[PDB]
Design a binder for this molecule. Structure first.
Ligand SMILES: [Cl-]
Ligand SMILES: [Mg+2]
Ligand SMILES: [Mg+2]
Ligand SMILES: [Mg+2]
Ligand SMILES: [Mg+2]
Ligand SMILES: [Mg+2]
Ligand SMILES: [Mg+2]
Ligand SMILES: [Mg+2]
Ligand code: NA
Ligand code: NA
Ligand code: NA
Ligand code: NA
Ligand code: NA
Ligand SMILES: [Sr+2]
Ligand SMILES: [Sr+2]
Ligand SMILES: [Sr+2]
Ligand SMILES: [Sr+2]
Ligand SMILES: [Sr+2]
Lengths: 119, 46, 81, 194, 65
RNA sequence: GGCGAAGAACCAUGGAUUUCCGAAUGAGAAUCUCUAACAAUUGCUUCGCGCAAUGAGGAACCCCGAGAACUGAAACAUCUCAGUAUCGGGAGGAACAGAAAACGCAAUGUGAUGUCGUUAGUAACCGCGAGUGAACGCGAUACAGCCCAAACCGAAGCCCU
RNA sequence: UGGAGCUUUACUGCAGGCUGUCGCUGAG
């Protein structure tokens, strides 16, 4: 909420999650805020996911700006457990990062684009 | 006054406790109930 | 576990209630109710209890005055014990 | 590379700057309408918690505790006192609010033992600290290589005897050399002069 | 007394409970006779009856009844 | 009057029984009563008191807090008595302390911490009055060093059964 | 160069009230 500066349409989110699954079954994904963060910092991140129901928010506040000074695109997910589930986890996840997808390389390429337009 | 069942057991004990030292104990010990009490001169608890 | 009847209460007054009114007197545990005294007696002497009266004595124990049915003879019961 | 945690750390260096300042303005409103001791599911300051000993494991509890700011709430003498002792307004207690918070936290959980604590801000009248508490009787804690030491019978109520992090600093034990003469190995042992 | 531990151990769980109610009744008839200032007694027995009952109960506990 | 050679008494160890009140815990009560009970606060949780924890005691010792005055100064206020008496909380068989952001016989030196002897009534404090009062080091006692957070890995893991 | 109770524009202090200032505390 304080780290969220734009709202993502349910539909767009549903897409992104579907893409994250094929990216984890084809390409490569990072689960967890720390792994996601190092990813963004190392440049390997192509698309980072950030939940919106993270309490405390200190866990993620940094992502948005960090991602910006790295050109890394990012998208919000209304729920924490959905993102974790999508990342193939039996638990929730505050942040996930697609580190070079697969079979989704294109599908996500547009997602990054659609978001830009969404400010 | 009115006495509860417990208060009665206590008064009851204090009554039995107020006895002579058995005649035979004085023989066995080759020659006093230091706790002997009187209703008027003494005062029990409660 | 405590037993209900402790011992018969034999005194001049107890003897009368026995002779004149077919009543027996016992020293019972002070946790026993009239009902528990009645049942206890019928089972110990095989007699029928019509009524029970209890009193918490100044001796610390409970006294019970058990009246037997006209079918039983207090004196007789008391005699065997 | 920097860890995700270093960011939570970084933000809390200046709690009245940036987003967190905004976050605090938010939270505190809710905190103020809250109890004296409130159990929370997750540390507000993850870096701090993990750094103090926290672990995402069973038998590990966290709790925010509110305490009034200021000097001692002292009653004025009701009998003769020399001028030096007629003091009331400037008298402050020898225990710091944080230690006081750890103790209140601990009473709420008669079975847990304080592992450590840290502050999470304050408004003009409150002061909030989060206290990490541990359940000495739960396995998963007993079997833990990092925390099992807190299960020792010797650690029964370590806070009330000042064996806590904050306890030891307050007791003046931080320095191993100069200035810790009447402090180590205990205040009471030195005739209470530290 | 006349009743030894061995004998109690030889008894059946049901014979002990029978020997108990039997012993309890003798103790009762003794205290009854004592309450009436009775004379024909053997004080050393009213004492033995109590130990007897203590033994059977201790054995009963031992044998699981 | 009884028990004991069916080896009692007595002693050691182990076991049985162990009323009611009592932290006292189903509710209440001057040790009793009333109609199934971990009361209350917690942890885990099959979210059910299912599994556990706390409570109170102990001669003093010990740790953490609150903290006088008589008194001394030949008055007295700082100071002194004294961080004493006393009060609140808490642990153990001992407590606390403890592996240097140390020391600073200044060094090409020492090498976790208590304690004892000494350093010393020295340095320092102080109506610079009365009084208060260390440390480093040294000689001993005993000696013992380790574990996390994070980086790099990222479920490779833990608990109940 | 005792004690206590009481008094006051005795000496020295301590509560309490009033008042300024900092924090809470923000936008034009
Ligand atoms: Cl504790
Ligand atoms: Mg009546
Ligand atoms: Mg390890
Ligand atoms: Mg003087
Ligand atoms: Mg010591
Ligand atoms: Mg002078
Ligand atoms: Mg020095
Ligand atoms: Mg005077
Ligand atoms: Na009297
Ligand atoms: Na506790
Ligand atoms: Na000091
Ligand atoms: Na439960
Ligand atoms: Na006076
Ligand atoms: Sr979760
Ligand atoms: Sr009189
Ligand atoms: Sr009588
Ligand atoms: Sr305790
Ligand atoms: Sr050594």
């Amino acid at each position: 909420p304080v780290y969220v500066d734009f709202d993502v349409p349910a539909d767009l989110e549903d897409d992104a999650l579907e893409a994250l699954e094929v990216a984890r079954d084809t390409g490569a994904v990072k689960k967890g805020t720390n792994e996601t963060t190092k990813s963004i910092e190392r440049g390997s991140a192509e698309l980072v996911f950030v939940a919106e129901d993270v309490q405390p928010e200190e866990i993620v506040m940094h992502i948005p700006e960090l991602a910006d000074e790295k050109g890394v695109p990012f998208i919000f997910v209304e729920q924490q457990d959905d993102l974790g589930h999508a990342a193939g986890l039996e638990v929730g996840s505050a942040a996930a990062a697609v580190t070079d997808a697969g079979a989704a390389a294109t599908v996500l390429e547009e997602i990054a684009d659609k978001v830009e337009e969404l400010r | 006054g009115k006495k509860s069942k417990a208060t009665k057991k206590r008064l009851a004990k204090l009554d039995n406790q107020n006895s002579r030292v058995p005649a035979w104990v004085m023989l066995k010990t080759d020659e006093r109930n230091h706790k002997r009490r009187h209703w008027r001169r003494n005062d029990t608890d409660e | 576990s405590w037993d209900v009847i402790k011992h018969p209460h034999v005194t001049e007054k107890a003897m009368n209630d026995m002779d004149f009114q077919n009543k027996l007197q016992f020293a019972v545990d002070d946790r026993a109710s009239k009902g528990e005294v009645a049942d206890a007696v019928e089972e110990q002497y095989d007699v029928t209890v019509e009524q029970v009266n209890t009193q918490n004595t100044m001796d610390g124990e409970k006294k019970a005055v058990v009246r037997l049915s006209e079918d039983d003879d207090a004196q007789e019961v008391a005699s065997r014990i | 590379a920097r860890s995700a945690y270093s960011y939570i750390r970084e933000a809390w260096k200046r709690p009245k700057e940036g987003q967190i300042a905004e976050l605090m303005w938010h939270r505190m409103q809710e905190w103020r309408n809250e109890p004296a001791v409130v159990r929370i599911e997750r540390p507000t300051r993850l870096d701090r918690a993990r750094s103090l000993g926290y672990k995402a494991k069973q038998g590990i509890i966290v709790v925010r505790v509110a305490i009034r700011k200021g000097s001692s709430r002292r009653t004025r003498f009701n009998k003769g006192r020399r001028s030096k002792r007629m003091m009331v307004n400037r008298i402050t207690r020898k225990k710091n609010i944080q230690r006081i918070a750890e103790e209140r936290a601990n009473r709420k959980f008669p079975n847990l033992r304080v592992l450590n604590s840290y502050s999470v801000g304050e408004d003009g009248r409150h002061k909030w600290h989060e206290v990490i508490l541990i359940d000495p009787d739960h396995p998963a804690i007993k079997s833990d290589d990092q925390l099992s030491w807190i299960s020792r019978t010797r650690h029964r109520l370590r806070t009330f005897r000042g064996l806590t992090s904050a306890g030891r600093r307050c007791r003046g034990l931080r320095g191993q050399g100069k200035g810790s003469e009447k402090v180590r190995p205990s205040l009471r042992v030195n005739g209470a002069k530290a | 007394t006349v009743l030894h531990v061995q004998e109690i151990r030889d008894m059946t769980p049901a014979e002990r409970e029978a020997e108990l109610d039997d012993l309890k009744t003798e103790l009762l008839n003794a205290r009854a006779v004592q309450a009436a200032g009775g004379a024909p007694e053997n004080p050393g027995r009213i004492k033995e009856l109590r130990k007897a009952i203590a033994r059977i109960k201790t054995i009963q506990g031992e044998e699981g009844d």
